[PDB]
Design a protein around this ligand. Structure first.
Ligand SMILES: [Pt+2]
Ligand SMILES: [Pt+2]
Length: 129
């Protein structure tokens, strides 16, 4: 599923991400835009052999089992393919564990390089929330 910007903002708000660990909703929308282009089916291979999955590009090095990432963890206790659903529940629940783990949204390279220190409120401008 390829979300519209405001549709994804609404879904993320419903799932409790607005100001989750102090990250405003525009942070999560900005992160999704530059991780996945709002596409739940997005997958990308990392240099280390792991893969990133779904709308928030959750990596198999730590967070999910994709059956092909040796010496990795599955801290969200999910098959990586769960993260590709049109339903963003699994990605959001796993993202809440990630962002809680001490490093905040710095875990998302696209957030650190493209969203952090920017006017992320722009990402939700015009949306019915
Ligand atoms: Pt808000
Ligand atoms: Pt502003």
């Amino acid at each position: 599923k390829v979300f519209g910007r405001c549709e994804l903002a609404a879904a993320m708000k419903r799932h409790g991400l607005d100001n989750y660990r102090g990250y405003s909703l525009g942070n999560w929308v900005c992160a999704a835009k530059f991780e996945s282009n709002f596409n739940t089916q997005a997958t990308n291979r990392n240099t280390d052999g792991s893969t990133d999955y779904g709308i928030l590009q959750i990596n198999s090095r730590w967070w999910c089992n994709d059956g092909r990432t040796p010496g990795s963890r599955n801290l969200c206790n999910i098959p990586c393919s769960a993260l590709l659903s049109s339903d963003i529940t699994a990605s959001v629940n796993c993202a809440k564990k990630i962002v809680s783990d001490g490093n905040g949204m710095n875990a998302w390279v696209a957030w650190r390089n493209r969203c952090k220190g920017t006017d992320v409120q722009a990402w939700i401008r015009g949306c019915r929330l």
